[PDB]
Scaffold this active site. Structure first.
Site, PDB file in Angstrom:
ATOM      1  N   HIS A 189       0.800  -1.217   0.000  1.00 30.61           N
ATOM      2  CA  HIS A 189       0.000   0.000   0.000  1.00 30.61           C
ATOM      3  C   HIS A 189       0.840   1.277   0.000  1.00 30.61           C
ATOM      4  O   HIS A 189       0.493   2.252  -0.667  1.00 30.61           O
ATOM      5  CB  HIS A 189      -0.964  -0.004   1.188  1.00 30.61           C
ATOM      6  CG  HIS A 189      -2.091  -0.980   1.055  1.00 30.61           C
ATOM      7  ND1 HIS A 189      -1.937  -2.331   1.279  1.00 30.61           N
ATOM      8  CD2 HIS A 189      -3.391  -0.799   0.725  1.00 30.61           C
ATOM      9  CE1 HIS A 189      -3.094  -2.941   1.091  1.00 30.61           C
ATOM     10  NE2 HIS A 189      -3.993  -2.034   0.754  1.00 30.61           N
TER      11      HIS A 189
ATOM     12  N   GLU B  13       3.321  -1.655   7.883  1.00 27.00           N
ATOM     13  CA  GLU B  13       4.281  -1.604   6.789  1.00 27.00           C
ATOM     14  C   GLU B  13       5.504  -0.737   7.096  1.00 27.00           C
ATOM     15  O   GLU B  13       6.607  -1.029   6.633  1.00 27.00           O
ATOM     16  CB  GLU B  13       3.597  -1.155   5.494  1.00 27.00           C
ATOM     17  CG  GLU B  13       2.593  -2.163   4.949  1.00 27.00           C
ATOM     18  CD  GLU B  13       1.950  -1.717   3.647  1.00 27.00           C
ATOM     19  OE1 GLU B  13       2.313  -0.635   3.137  1.00 27.00           O
ATOM     20  OE2 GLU B  13       1.079  -2.449   3.134  1.00 27.00           O
TER      21      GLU B  13
ATOM     22  N   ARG C 109     -22.741  14.498  15.733  1.00 29.52           N
ATOM     23  CA  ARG C 109     -23.259  15.583  14.909  1.00 29.52           C
ATOM     24  C   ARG C 109     -24.591  15.155  14.318  1.00 29.52           C
ATOM     25  O   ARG C 109     -24.638  14.294  13.440  1.00 29.52           O
ATOM     26  CB  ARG C 109     -22.293  15.929  13.775  1.00 29.52           C
ATOM     27  CG  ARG C 109     -20.861  16.160  14.209  1.00 29.52           C
ATOM     28  CD  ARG C 109     -19.960  16.328  12.997  1.00 29.52           C
ATOM     29  NE  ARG C 109     -18.547  16.273  13.352  1.00 29.52           N
ATOM     30  CZ  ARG C 109     -17.678  17.249  13.113  1.00 29.52           C
ATOM     31  NH1 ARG C 109     -18.073  18.358  12.504  1.00 29.52           N
ATOM     32  NH2 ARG C 109     -16.410  17.110  13.474  1.00 29.52           N
TER      33      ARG C 109
ATOM     34  N   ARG D  52     -16.566  22.656  19.765  1.00 33.46           N
ATOM     35  CA  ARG D  52     -17.951  22.222  19.662  1.00 33.46           C
ATOM     36  C   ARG D  52     -18.863  23.187  20.408  1.00 33.46           C
ATOM     37  O   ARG D  52     -19.959  23.504  19.950  1.00 33.46           O
ATOM     38  CB  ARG D  52     -18.110  20.815  20.240  1.00 33.46           C
ATOM     39  CG  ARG D  52     -17.247  19.761  19.567  1.00 33.46           C
ATOM     40  CD  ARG D  52     -17.634  19.589  18.111  1.00 33.46           C
ATOM     41  NE  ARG D  52     -19.015  19.136  17.967  1.00 33.46           N
ATOM     42  CZ  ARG D  52     -19.364  17.891  17.659  1.00 33.46           C
ATOM     43  NH1 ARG D  52     -18.433  16.969  17.456  1.00 33.46           N
ATOM     44  NH2 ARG D  52     -20.645  17.569  17.551  1.00 33.46           N
TER      45      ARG D  52
HETATM   46  C1  LIG Z   1     -12.376  19.491  11.587  1.00 32.13           C
HETATM   47  C2  LIG Z   1     -12.134  18.189  12.234  1.00 32.13           C
HETATM   48  C3  LIG Z   1     -11.141  17.355  11.769  1.00 32.13           C
HETATM   49  N1  LIG Z   1     -10.916  16.084  12.413  1.00 32.13           N
HETATM   50  C4  LIG Z   1      -9.877  15.194  11.936  1.00 32.13           C
HETATM   51  C5  LIG Z   1     -10.425  14.043  11.140  1.00 32.13           C
HETATM   52  C6  LIG Z   1      -9.454  13.896  10.055  1.00 32.13           C
HETATM   53  O1  LIG Z   1      -8.458  13.029  10.406  1.00 32.13           O
HETATM   54  C7  LIG Z   1      -8.897  15.261   9.903  1.00 32.13           C
HETATM   55  C8  LIG Z   1      -9.675  15.998   8.888  1.00 32.13           C
HETATM   56  O2  LIG Z   1      -9.669  15.265   7.723  1.00 32.13           O
HETATM   57  O3  LIG Z   1      -8.973  15.892  11.146  1.00 32.13           O
HETATM   58  C9  LIG Z   1     -11.716  15.682  13.531  1.00 32.13           C
HETATM   59  O4  LIG Z   1     -11.514  14.602  14.066  1.00 32.13           O
HETATM   60  N2  LIG Z   1     -12.739  16.539  14.010  1.00 32.13           N
HETATM   61  C10 LIG Z   1     -12.960  17.774  13.386  1.00 32.13           C
HETATM   62  O5  LIG Z   1     -13.840  18.513  13.797  1.00 32.13           O
END
Ligand SMILES: Cc1cn([C@H]2C[C@H](O)[C@@H](CO)O2)c(=O)[nH]c1=O
Ligand SMILES: Cc1cn([C@H]2C[C@H](O)[C@@H](CO)O2)c(=O)[nH]c1=O
Ligand SMILES: Cc1cn([C@H]2C[C@H](O)[C@@H](CO)O2)c(=O)[nH]c1=O
Ligand SMILES: Cc1cn([C@H]2C[C@H](O)[C@@H](CO)O2)c(=O)[nH]c1=O
Ligand SMILES: Cc1cn([C@H]2C[C@H](O)[C@@H](CO)O2)c(=O)[nH]c1=O
Ligand SMILES: [K+]
Lengths: 250, 245, 250, 250, 250, 250
Positions: free
Chosen positions: D5, D77, D165, D220
């Site tokens: 991968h 890996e 959410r 949040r």
């Molecule tokens: C904006 C945001 C990103 N993320 C993480 C998830 C992903 O790994 C990355 C965004 O792609 O950050 C969260 O866990 N919660 C959030 O609110």
């Protein structure tokens, strides 16, 4: 009728508050022969109900069918009527070597190997039989002197995989029941049944009373087929006990 | 010693096959107050033991301490010694209004909230007490003739949260236990205690006979403090022990 | 008094918000021999506490006893009093060969093989030791030239079945634990104890600081349970290390 | 091409015993821009690998992408290659109003709300970061002067329903997660992330050191949204930290 | 603009309500090249979204990447845009001997060895594909003249441990997964995949349409490992299938 | 006899490999009364078996009873005969307002609120219907021109709790089934029955073809209650579809 599945009325109760609940419909009558004024109520699907007098006091005998689900429906609706007490009287196969074929077993509590119990109480809640009803069974066996032991009973949903029966189409058993047979043996579990745990969980947690008596058809360790149909008189030997247990409850 | 935790020996038993198991180290000698000839054998850590005789036959009383884990230690090792019968006495918290303070409750089976029981048998296995023991217990409480009720007991692994207590430092409770005591109301549970589930499952799953009995110093519904520190449960135990002896 | 089990009042702390939690009550007075002006408070049940002072501030050392339940009670009860920081000293057996007799063990987090932990958090929430409590132990373990091991440790509910000791009455171990130490061995888990996961969970989930340190008296893999008591002055290492670590948070 | 991968080998590593593992394919170079001798290697799917050095020693910066499963393969890996130390840099959503926007989060342990962790450890096994890797992250955030908060971070397997959410297209939340978010903050959970638990357990599970740090993006509770578009300097602020921690960790 | 991860505004899909969702981002476009007016939409993270016209009607092709977590976001963020049908195509690992390379497998429902699914519905809830969507998959696969089988697919959350891959860094498979492939093989499970179950579960529980078709480049019982170009040739053979399958559902 | 509960012999089949298996013993007659050469076979316990011929091929209609356990036994014994195709027809409760009174329900997969299905496959395994049987069943509904719905079905062990019924003795149900109907209401499940998940899992695991079709005899959700007394039109209208589907799978 007042009720959907049983098809009985409050007047059909006849003042009764107790019900005997065997699994086989055609053995409900066998109980009714030992009582007074045997009157049938209905026999639909798996459910067959009967009316009779014990010491002339009203008592109902109804068939549960096979499994918790079928049992869960009747026990609920009898209580709708309603009953406050239930008696199981099931046919079973034992898994302990020291127990002989054709013995009578009183169960204190049941191993929740079913899924019907979870509908009334979480898995942590024990599937335990009522002390008053439990006492009655041995106290009815006190008079007879039937082979009886004190112990726990397994209550599986399935006949073949759950009890570990292999001469089947698949010939396969899931990881959960892999080595389940001796797992219960070294635990002290006496037999495999399918209706108990549901009933006992359904009763203890809903403020109801229930006992559990069983007649051995075969020891799962032993090899010889049961001595049929001669030993069937011993099926009445468990019947004569469960009937006697209903006296001493008045 | 023979064992690492108790400090008992084969001589200490005297061929005893019955052991009373309270939770208080300080009440072990208090149990021998109705028994004959007390003599102390080992009082290491949580466990205090007093060898005595009942009707000329060897009997032991050993404290389990507080909690399933510690109880399992006692029962297992006592059994290794050569005991197959275990009668637990203690105090509990009532859930039923018809149950008053001063009444003794006997356990048919335990709601296994604990986790030590899982080390002996999976969740599916019920936590039942021996009928021979249970008969004696009920036939001892009536032999005394005190107000007695039989039923199901819930055995938490924790004192506060597992028994839904909000007076604690946090005042919060996990969802599983949030409103669970109210859920336990209709289930018909009489009492709360902390040692039965491990005790009953370890005995039922090893071919051992064990009994459970408890008095009430508080009713959860009752918002009342008990009358002061002088106001059966012990006398029953010896009597209950006498029967199967 | 305010509480029930400890039977103490807040005044007895004299403003102390730090507590040391061993299992053995007889050790408590031995631990407080490393602190000064030691004042006995009570010995109600297991829970034997003592009043001491270090660096001008009041320090409390209270016993819990074996098992999460015992731990849960005191740790809860110490809090309303109330301590906000908890350091546990214990006596343990490791499962990894390189760990020899006389080793001091510090744990970052613990395997929830217990059930008491579940009362504070679901099985998903990790039982992790607080950093401020963790680092002080490591900073103290390095100073006095003690053999230190940092890592993950298993926390069993039971002593004999849970830690996979087959030399028991029954001579059997349930499926879940039959082959369990085989796993932990390869996971890199350090040592076997009974109180760590519970204490950590109730502290990490209630917003409290929790430290953990224990001493090696026996190896699980190594054939021989070592000579009963001689050298385990190691406790002193284990108690010295926690004492120096404790001074810092104050 | 030993790996299936990643699309890489040690030859491109090269001689590295540490691997920095962010979760964004684009940002990898910007991390390597702070590292000596930065050399691009390959970019396949989630994975984006660069070769560089810090303080004379080789360091690997490869992106895991989004999700445990994507993280898990990378770890196997890379460690096959192999890294002993895995350092993840990230962005997260804070659930604590007491935490302000623009700060940096170092995770000691993660609530395993993922499924990938179960492949390397039972639910009982905690997801904890190694003590050494965790301390340097703490030190680095101090060393750069970023507002540090250390703790436990909930590691969901989904972005919307797993982090509570209701803004799902359906607008619903599974029962298991209904009311889970307000349940975590009171327990002391700082933020929401998606990959640590997978990395944390398997590394703790497989034998390897692991550290976790991430930049705060949004709260949040706080109704103030990060400014567009360079309030994402918080990641760069955290990037200063990941290299500085790596600078001490080797 | 207009969603978080994909970064797509809704007009950019031209009212399209069906999306093919392969896992390989740079392999996404070779599918979309067979459709009229092939147009790049955007390339954020692992997601490369394309817009195309089927029958002259708008259809979308988006990347999922590796794992349910990353897959969940796509399907979800595609859902606000109006897409209600998702056809997933990828490479899978068969576990039944009778299925050999070049054979494409359509999945009706999946063994949920995932974690992501659990965020939408309980373990009791099945990960099943839409009937009308499923008939179509094989309805096109046959038209092409492909060797196709119909059944159940096991869906792991990790590439290696979950699919019981033995030669790994620690060379160990977790207790839960020790010998699971043998279970599924004897249970009638066709293949191994990391994304279906989550996709299947959500859409079935979100009220959407979901399809699963995949080409076998490797069978697990097979001692072999995918050999180009027979594997890669069959990919277009599977692309043509899912593309033709798309036309029917449009 | 060869089997135990049914008391059947492979000659009674006369080479039948397909079976229509409703739960009620009484109804079985009518199902064969619309078939050619109606021959009653055996009638023991809850299990009444019949032999018929459609399109020149041997067909069979046997009763399974209520709930999973009996259903497991019948299907097991019948398959030992051995049948390889199982068309389940029964009555059910509508949980969707749009699904009207007199509607036919085809089930692709079922929610496993039962316990007997755990005895053949872990909960991860989907209770999915075989596509060939499904398609035949669906297209049969197509051939007739009767209101039909395609979807998912819930399968409880117990009649009253599992389907959110209040008017019982206690009037209480365990927390697990609290507003759980509303869960399925939003998730998109169609109906409530007590048998499918066992059959579906049993066969798929076994593995063998099976189908499920059912009929609306109640909607709890809609204000409208079903009429008395033989109003449940669908039961006869739905069997018309299953006997039509029975004629097609041959
Ligand atoms: C904006 C945001 C990103 N993320 C993480 C998830 C992903 O790994 C990355 C965004 O792609 O950050 C969260 O866990 N919660 C959030 O609110
Ligand atoms: C004969 C036999 C019956 N049973 C069950 C099936 C029925 O449901 C029940 C009859 O009371 O007993 C077993 O579980 N095992 C057996 O060996
Ligand atoms: C006060 C009290 C104690 N207990 C038990 C818990 C401990 O085992 C012991 C402590 O005194 O008594 C209860 O179960 N409920 C109560 O209300
Ligand atoms: C000696 C020893 C102790 N322990 C546990 C028992 C004690 O309660 C704990 C120390 O508190 O250590 C083990 O689990 N295994 C062991 O070998
Ligand atoms: C009335 C009713 C029956 N049934 C099923 C259960 C039994 O299998 C059968 C007989 O009552 O009908 C339901 O599933 N839901 C219902 O509401
Ligand atoms: K204790």
């Amino acid at each position: 009728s007042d009720v959907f599945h049983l098809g009985l009325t409050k007047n059909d109760l006849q003042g009764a508050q107790l019900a005997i609940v065997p699994g086989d419909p055609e053995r409900v009558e066998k109980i009714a022969a030992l009582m007074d004024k045997p009157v049938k109520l209905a026999s639909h699907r798996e459910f067959t109900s009967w009316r009779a007098e014990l010491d002339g006091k009203a008592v109902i005998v109804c068939s549960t069918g096979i499994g918790g689900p079928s049992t869960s429906i009747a026990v609920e609706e009898l209580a709708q009527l309603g009953i406050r007490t239930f008696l199981r009287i099931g046919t079973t196969g034992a898994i302990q070597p020291h127990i002989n074929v054709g013995d009578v077993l009183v169960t204190t509590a049941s191993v929740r190997l079913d899924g019907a119990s979870l509908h009334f109480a979480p898995m942590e809640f024990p599937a335990v039989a009522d002390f008053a009803c439990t006492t009655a069974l041995v106290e009815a066996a006190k008079s007879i002197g039937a082979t009886t032991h004190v112990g726990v009973t397994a209550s599986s949903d399935t006949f073949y995989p759950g009890q570990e029966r292999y001469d089947t189409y698949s010939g396969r058993v899931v990881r959960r029941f892999k080595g389940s047979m001796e797992e219960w043996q070294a635990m002290g579990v006496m037999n495999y049944e399918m209706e108990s745990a549901t009933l006992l969980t359904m009763c203890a947690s809903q403020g109801l009373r229930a006992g559990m008596v069983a007649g051995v058809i075969v020891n799962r360790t032993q090899q010889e087929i049961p001595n049929a149909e001669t030993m069937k008189q011993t099926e009445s030997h468990a019947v004569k006990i469960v009937v006697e247990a209903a006296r001493r409850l008045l």
